[PDB]
Each structure stands twice: as C-alpha cells, then as structure tokens.
Ligand binder design. Structure first.
Ligand code: 478
Lengths: 99, 99
C-alpha cells in the first residue's frame, strides 16, 4: 500500500497475539516499543533519541506482523513516547520512500 | 526517486544558501534543524521524543530545497543531534511510503 504523509503513518501491528498501534518511522534506526511483556532472554541496552539516552530491554528475533507483512528481528522495549517501527523492520517488509 | 532503507535516508537540503545533510523522517511531525541563525521572528517551543524534550525556535514560511524540490514551511531550530525533514515538508514534495 502507498501511504501519504498528511497524517501520522500509523499502522496496526501484531506481536504476541496482541494488537498494538505503531508509527512507521524512517528516522529511527531501530524498532522501539512501549513497556510490555515479551517472552525470552533480553539484554539491557541504551539508545539515544532527540532528547537524550534511555535504557531499554533488547529482544532478539521477534516475529512481528505489520499490516499483514511478516518480519522477524530485534525489538527494543522501553520508555518511548510512542511505538515506532524502525529501519531494521521496515527493510524486511520492503518499505521504501518515493517522491 | 526511490530511497531504500538499508541505510539512513540522508539527503541534501538547501536553506539560506547553506546546503546540509538531512534525514527524511516520516516519524517527525515537523522539521527540526540544528542551530543556525535564521532571520525573522520566531516563537519558543518544546518538542519531545526519546530521551525527553528540547527547546527549539519555531520559524514560519522558510524556503527549503530538498533534492532539487521546492518546499516552504515551518522549521524548528534547536540542539538536535540530527537534522530532520518532517511530514510537514515531506507532503510538499509529494513523498510517500511504499511496500
Ligand atoms: C518517533 C519519535 C522518536 C519521535 N521523532 C522521530 C524519530 O524519527 C527520531 C529522529 C532522530 C534520530 C537520531 C537522533 C535524533 C532524532 N528517531 C529516534 O528517536 O531514533 C532512535 C530510536 C531507534 O533508533 C534511534 S523525534 O525525533 O523526537 C521528533 C519529534 C518532533 C519533531 N517535531 C521532530 C522530531
């Protein structure tokens, strides 16, 4: 599907039988989700945003469905103002910018 | 043009005779550029993201050239780690997301 940008590019994602809303963010290198419980061994990590660095929990090889498109990769969970799908998963579903 | 996301979507932008590298960011509602002395009246503002908030100066009606594409709109100037071209300007040059 082709998405215009007059509105926030929000999509419904499915992760762990749960349905959440997330923003397709080409400005984020990684995928960062709001606090939630994911299964598996996670490792502490720190990422930097526009306002500074935060601590997050890193989960590897996580299956996530983005508008019916399957991706399997790294997902960071922590204090983000909103769920964002970064380039690590966008590239998996073949997302590109056009103009 | 078609930009893939294997790497950061960096592009060349022209502002006030100055050419800079900026990120095409569908995740940014508004454009935010690193500190620079732009002429004109401006309004103080606080924007937040990962890590918290930063104070920026809002300028309106600023002419910008994104990869040879003419655009004119609001621009936020402050201590941002990275220059970001947001949806406000992305919609102007007809940029879309595809997959
Ligand atoms: C989705 C959230 C974070 C909100 N914004 C968009 C994001 O794309 C933002 C862009 C950015 C990249 C690198 C350094 C600094 C900023 N990336 C971000 O945090 O990347 C992290 C998450 C994983 O990988 C790296 S924002 O920058 O706060 C923002 C908010 C308001 C305006 N008006 C303009 C920009």
């Amino acid at each position: 599907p082709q998405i215009t940008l007059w509105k926030r590019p929000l999509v419904t994602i499915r992760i762990g039988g749960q349905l959440k809303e997330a923003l397709l963010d080409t400005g984020a290198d990684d995928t960062v989700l709001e606090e939630m419980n994911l299964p598996g061994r996670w490792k502490p990590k720190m990422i930097g945003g526009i306002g500074g660095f935060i601590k997050v929990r890193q989960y590897d090889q996580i299956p996530i469905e983005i508008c019916g498109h399957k991706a399997i990769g790294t997902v960071l969970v922590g204090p983000t103002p909103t769920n964002v799908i970064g380039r690590n998963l966008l590239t998996q579903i073949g997302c590109t910018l056009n103009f």
